[PDB]
Design a protein around this ligand. Sequence first.
Ligand SMILES: CC(C)(COP(=O)(O)OP(=O)(O)OC[C@H]1O[C@@H](n2cnc3c(N)ncnc32)[C@H](O)[C@@H]1OP(=O)(O)O)[C@@H](O)C(=O)NCCC(=O)NCCS
Length: 173
Amino acid sequence: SVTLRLMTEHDLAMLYEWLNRSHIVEWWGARPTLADVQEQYLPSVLAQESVTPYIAMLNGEPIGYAQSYVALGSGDGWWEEETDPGVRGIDQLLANASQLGKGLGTKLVRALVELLFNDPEVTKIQTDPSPSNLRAIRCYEKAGFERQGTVTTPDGPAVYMVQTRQAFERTRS
Ligand SMILES: CC(C)(COP(=O)(O)OP(=O)(O)OC[C@H]1O[C@@H](n2cnc3c(N)ncnc32)[C@H](O)[C@@H]1OP(=O)(O)O)[C@@H](O)C(=O)NCCC(=O)NCCS
């Protein structure tokens, strides 16, 4: 089973290594220096953009990184049409290339979705994989997200996917 813990400052050097692995570099929104990671992913810095970092754990070992964010609190250009403060967005990665395509990502996303719905004010979860990122799209579908359509983001077009609280209630059983 995959669990999630808050990321700390002590995880930054580890995250730096992960973010420079080829399987991560090709998708993650490119090759950050250690200083880049320390300056941008420090939990208190991410907090300023309403972003919460997590480390995914499996059998006592860190296996991935995830982020949740309040869409309404995102930076300029991001989710500019949003009006609901209950909307959360997610992003995630698996650290080890050998562990890709084995269902661990789906387990990670499911764990993150459950955590977020334990915030009573949360109404809906969104994700924004790029159209080219078909593996991520299928992962989110397996985790209970539904493709809505194409949206323009500051990083380019994305396949906008959502999972509502009601949908989670009906499938969690
Ligand atoms: C996205 C990510 C977290 C998904 O985790 P994962 O464990 O690899 O995904 P899962 O094994 O749970 O599911 C992958 C699904 O995608 C499918 N798939 C893989 N490549 C595909 C492709 N090119 N086209 C269509 N489907 C594809 C697999 O068949 C599998 O579905 P299945 O169970 O029906 O066979 C992981 O691949 C990852 O960290 N990728 C690199 C970073 C990244 O892309 N981050 C997300 C950015 S939005």
